[PDB]
Structure formats: C-alpha cells, structure tokens
C-alpha cells in the first residue's frame, strides 16, 4: 500500500512534473526561435530597411 498509494503515486506525480518541465523547455526553445531567428531577426531586417 505504501509503494502504490504513496511511493508509486509520488513517482507518477514526479513523472508528470518532469513532463511539464520538458514541455516548458520546448516552449522556451520555441520562444527563443521566435525571438532570435524571428523577432530579433525581424528587428535586424527592420533596422536594415530603416
């Protein structure tokens, strides 16, 4: 009972938190993509044209 309801349930919650961590990391990578190769690239081209 300790293993299932407490230890393995804690393991499941930890795995869900790790999945959320990976999703946040992926979102961060996408945001740096939209920033550097995007919004700052757009800033560079806008500054070039200006």
């Amino acid at each position: 009972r300790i293993i299932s309801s407490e230890v393995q349930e804690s393991n499941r919650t930890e795995t869900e938190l790790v999945g959320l961590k990976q999703n946040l990391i992926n979102n961060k990578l996408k945001l740096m993509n939209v920033l550097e190769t995007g919004i700052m690239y757009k800033l560079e081209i806008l500054q070039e044209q200006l």
Partner: protein, 49 residues
C-alpha cells in the same frame, strides 16, 4: 524582408476593398466604395493617361 501595403499596386487594394464591399454591401459602405472608386477612376486614372 518586410514589404509595406503601399508597395502592393493600387489596383489590387481597390479590388480587395471592392470585394469587402461585396461581402458587406450596406449602404454606407457601398456609397463609400462608389465615392472612392469614382475618385480612383477620376484622379488616378487621369494621372494614368
């Protein structure tokens, strides 16, 4: 590279707004399109000849 709306030809913008008035034919929009298209074919077309 970024391209402004004005870089697009005036005829295409006029066609877009004509389509807009086709899908929203209410009397104020229709009259505005009539006036603006008359100004088109008068001023810009006179300039075109």
């Amino acid at each position: 590279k970024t391209i402004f709306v004005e870089d697009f030809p005036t005829d295409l913008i006029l066609k877009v707004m004509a389509e807009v008035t086709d899908l929203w034919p209410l009397t104020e929009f229709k009259q505005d399109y009539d006036q603006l298209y008359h100004n088109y074919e008068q001023l810009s077309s006179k300039l075109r000849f």
